[PDB]
Write a protein that binds this ligand. Structure first.
Ligand code: B12
Ligand code: B12
Lengths: 543, 542
């Protein structure tokens, strides 16, 4: 037993290592890079703690910047593999939910310290190699953000647990944060090793069990993430990894009456498809399935006449070209005051021209390749559509070559008129559209942005002038979900920029605050009355 | 302007007046009962501040316990009325959302004090007459719970506004809790004047505008709630009241691209139907509609051998027969240890036989009538089913008569085998089923309750024995939302028993905690960087 009201350790953001030359973390990284690249492995399903290749199609996972180089081979989950994954989750449920919160949380605090130290460069490396991330992009994702999700989620959970009610005289009211009945299906994207780790573990912390279907191109890091959790003491069957395209896994998972919920990422249309499925089929489920996730988007930057040019320039380059524009959203549209364009236009383009994309094992590169052949094709199409469109010049970039890796150069489009949002969402890649507007039209450009922005997760204003900043904060209040003043608009740091979403979204329960964790619990109130009534009659009834 | 970081008043639960003989409130209540009873009124739509009857069918609102006695007449909203309610909500948005939080909050704090004082017995009486509540049932709902929702929601909202993030070095991070874009559609049931007032006001607090469709049989108190709100200063068009059956209003609201959300009550099938509609048609909405609600259900009590017999008896009587069994949930099944039944069975039956249901203007009655003819038929069918079924005996009650009011007597059924949940959910009414179990089969019975209960909102254990209590808290952990020890399982007091829901439901965002108000906001993070980078190159690159 235990007689205590315990505290969890206090989280803080994990520091980002730089991997500068001569640094020890850089030497460690090269060891890990060579080790993963030179020793490709089977990437098996992990079900009830057993690692097994299955009977489905074998699919290679390769380095996107060098696609002839194999990192591993997975088998596409069959229906049978998925049914086994589910049975394993249901079978581990009882022992996992009975562990006290403090002991489930130690698993993830431990996993976090393991990722911060001895696993750090292995997980960074795996993310670099599979997902074509520069070391800095791997470090802010697979190390830091994943570490922070675990440590802050443990703190968020613990805070949820002490949210208790008032007891009136003669009674005692308490609240019990129950885990869900049934299993949770986590489907994770290629873009972040952190999201891939978090979507399955967050519900797990609150006492649930999980089946987890990672994106094929992220599966090296996902499998390693699974080994890390096992080394931290995650029990068998609490999370069950199934590799592949996910088709057979969804057939099975969505037909099972024990589906408690789905933690995923996707478009508005994906959400509506799932709503439609679950609403139509609601009588088939024991519980009402919970559908918790976030979308992608494309973002914008507006520079006022007071914008600092070098700040603006650097925000556009990073915002648009960090990770080859493949974050959950990237900067696709810049609106730049004419006088500020005269000062930094040429520098933007020259630097964009010099910006090196190549093999990420060469640490001098800024970034790597696009994630796969389908992504490449989408970019090529968007470039060809721009070369032949009226409005648009290709001012720099637009070259591409899939012979060695899925390489697309940084590309700046100049549009004579405000760039239409519908074009920029058809791909994810290093393509930035710029529209130069007359300084005195700042307010009109803000209205144009507002009126033509349905798909931005984030926006930024660059301006030293306070009225200009405030006017943007007012006028674009609903045009994006996270807003930035004098920096690139980008991925949040955990605990710092929670929430957001594109216009009209309902996704404030996504990862990054306690609201996510709540979705993985079902609270009940318990009341005890000490001396209840012994007569049913009420004072109003007396003669 | 304003330079301040203000606090709101600290909410405490509103005290329940007893209305004892010779009490001042009882006199004031009789005054208000007569005024409403003797002076029936038109019950109009309230659109953009304008109180107007429409061209739809005329529908009388009557006293359910005296259905010859009209309280008012409403007009079934047409599509045109519904479209106008929507445009009015959209026209009022801009000025409402631009009011500072404190000024929006003050409207609901003021309405709370008005309801506590000058409007108190008027709103209670309206609820007594139209919904057929005893004075105590009106008081805990129409007065106290509704006041508590307003005062507690204001404090919850203010608490949300101060949840703010960490700023690291060189930056400032903040969070802005924006109202939604577009309108919120609130649809409210007959059972509670409190829910009916809260569902439309809660999102409004957060800066939204609303159309509200109340239940027909609750429209008297709804219209008077609307007036109380206008008298607290609610601006025109912020909440727009459309009366009737909802059909046309749902047609218009659901077809409008500006639908931001629906705040309602309903069954799992209703949620599923709305989910299917919104998902299938999601491409037509500017925002993803938010569907926020709760369900009803039917509850149980289990008595261990160690139960206090009088506590159980009272809990059973109140839990099943308070408001004629017509709360969101009511106690429909009791599982009683044989030795405790020997001790309070006869007394339960006798007290239920003597229990008086009648015209609630006679304050000596325990309760009134069922809400409408539809409800009454469902009860009759359930009583005749029970009589016909071999499993079940009618131990007391079972009489019914709709000639003057929709009256059904407290009824107790004796089931030789554990009573099946599917039977109890096809009516709301004063029908309690008792199954007597052998003392030593306590754990077996807890298992049968667990296995057989999917529709309980609440459950209770009556037992002085601590192991027995704890065994119930563990074994029935998932069998019900809110769980009660040595008391009747019923509706929460605000801030005391939040959350709950039936097995496997997903409604912790329902009214009664801050989570509900968050559903009516869209939070964004704002970050300002003071000295951002001027070179894009990274240290790893050297
Ligand atoms: C919804 C859906 C679509 C949607 C997705 C977006 C939307 N909702 O508007 C759309 C219409 C675009 C689509 C298109 C097609 N899909 Co489809 N679709 C699905 C469905 C019914 C559910 C997917 C889902 O939302 N899963 C939940 C999300 C959260 O998980 P996810 O892993 O992120 O899912 C993504 C992928 O499934 C991807 N996707 C969907 N379909 C296809 C097909 C292929 C070949 C690929 C590579 C990817 C892909 O889209 C999802 C959203 O990003 C499945 C059924 C199933 N068993 O998976 C099929 C299914 C995957 N689709 C299929 C087919 C055949 C198609 C099409 C070839 C023809 C068509 N128009 O339906 C194209 C191919 C698209 C492509 N990328 O090459 C087949 C594939 C059979 C196989 N290869 O084994 C499936 C299994 C249906 C079936 N059994 O017949 N599909
Ligand atoms: C879903 C639905 C049903 C469902 C509801 C529960 C469920 N999901 O299983 C079911 C299948 C039970 C149903 C039954 C019927 N309903 Co129907 N149904 C609806 C619908 C499509 C949506 C209602 C809703 O979910 N609203 C949202 C909720 C949150 O608001 P609510 O006010 O609490 O809604 C309640 C009422 O609408 C009630 N209800 C539903 N239908 C009917 C019909 C009548 C006459 C009454 C009095 C009540 C009622 O059920 C809802 C949930 O409790 C509407 C369309 C519309 N424009 O309203 C029709 C609609 C109201 N129904 C109608 C009809 C014809 C029927 C039936 C006569 C025949 C049938 N089976 O289709 C029966 C009558 C039942 C009765 N009580 O007398 C017509 C009424 C036309 C008119 N009189 O002007 C409508 C307008 C259109 C239609 N048929 O598609 N219905």
């Amino acid at each position: 037993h235990m007689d205590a009201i315990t505290q969890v350790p206090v989280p803080a953001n994990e520091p980002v290592h730089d991997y500068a030359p001569k640094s020890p973390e850089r030497t460690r990284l090269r060891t890990e890079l060579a080790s993963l690249a030179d020793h490709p492995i089977d990437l098996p399903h992990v079900i009830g703690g057993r690692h097994r290749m299955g009977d489905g199609e074998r699919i290679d996972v390769v380095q996107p910047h060098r696609h002839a180089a194999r990192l591993g081979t997975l088998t596409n989950a069959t229906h049978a593999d998925a049914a086994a994954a589910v049975e394993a989750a249901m079978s581990a449920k009882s022992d996992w939910a009975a562990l006290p919160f403090d002991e489930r949380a130690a698993v993830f605090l431990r996993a976090a310290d393991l990722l911060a130290g001895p696993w750090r460069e292995k997980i960074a490396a795996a993310t670099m190699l599979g997902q074509s991330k520069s070391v800095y992009q791997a470090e802010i994702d697979a190390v830091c953000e994943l570490i922070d999700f675990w440590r802050f989620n443990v703190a968020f959970a613990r805070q949820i647990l002490e949210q208790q009610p008032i007891s009136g005289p003669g009674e005692w009211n308490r609240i019990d944060y129950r885990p869900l009945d049934g299993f949770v299906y986590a489907i994770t994207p290629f873009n972040f090793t952190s999201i891939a780790g978090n979507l399955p573990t967050a519900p797990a912390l609150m006492g649930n069990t999980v089946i987890w279907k990672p994106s094929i191109t992220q599966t090296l890091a996902a499998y390693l993430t699974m080994q890390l959790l096992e080394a931290a003491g995650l029990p068998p069957g609490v999370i069950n990894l199934v590799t592949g395209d996910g088709f057979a896994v969804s057939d099975v998972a969505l037909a099972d009456p024990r589906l408690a919920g789905i933690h995923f990422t996707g478009s508005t249309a994906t959400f509506g498809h799932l709503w439609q499925w679950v609403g139509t089929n609601i009588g088939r489920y024991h519980s009402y399935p919970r559908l918790v996730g976030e979308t992608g988007g494309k973002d914008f930057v507006v520079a006022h006449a007071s914008a600092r040019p070098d700040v603006l320039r650097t925000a556009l380059i990073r915002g648009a070209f960090d990770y080859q524009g493949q974050k959950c959203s990237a900067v696709s549209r810049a609106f730049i005051a004419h006088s500020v364009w005269q000062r930094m236009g040429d520098e933007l383009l020259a630097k964009a021209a010099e910006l090196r994309y190549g093999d990420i094992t060469d640490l001098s590169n800024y970034g790597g390749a696009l994630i796969d052949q389908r992504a490449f094709v989408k970019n090529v199409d968007a470039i060809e559509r721009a070369k032949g469109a009226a409005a648009v010049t290709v001012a720099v970039g637009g070259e591409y070559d899939d012979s060695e890796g899925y390489f697309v150069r940084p590309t700046v489009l100049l549009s004579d008129d405000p760039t239409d949002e519908s074009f920029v969402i058809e791909y994810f890649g290093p393509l930035l559209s710029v529209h130069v507007y007359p300084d005195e039209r700042y307010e009109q450009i803000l209205d144009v942005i507002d009126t033509g922005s349905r798909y931005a997760l984030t926006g930024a204003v660059i301006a030293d002038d306070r009225q200009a900043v405030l006017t943007a904060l007012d006028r674009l209040r609903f045009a994006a979900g996270n807003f930035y003043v004098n920096d690139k608009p980008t991925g949040a740091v955990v605990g710092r920029q929670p929430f957001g979403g594109a216009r009209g979204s309902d996704t404030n329960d996504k990862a990054g605050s306690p609201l996510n964790l709540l979705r993985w619990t079902s609270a009940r109130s318990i009341k005890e009355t000490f001396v209840a009534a012994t007569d049913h009659i009420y004072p109003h009834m007396a003669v």
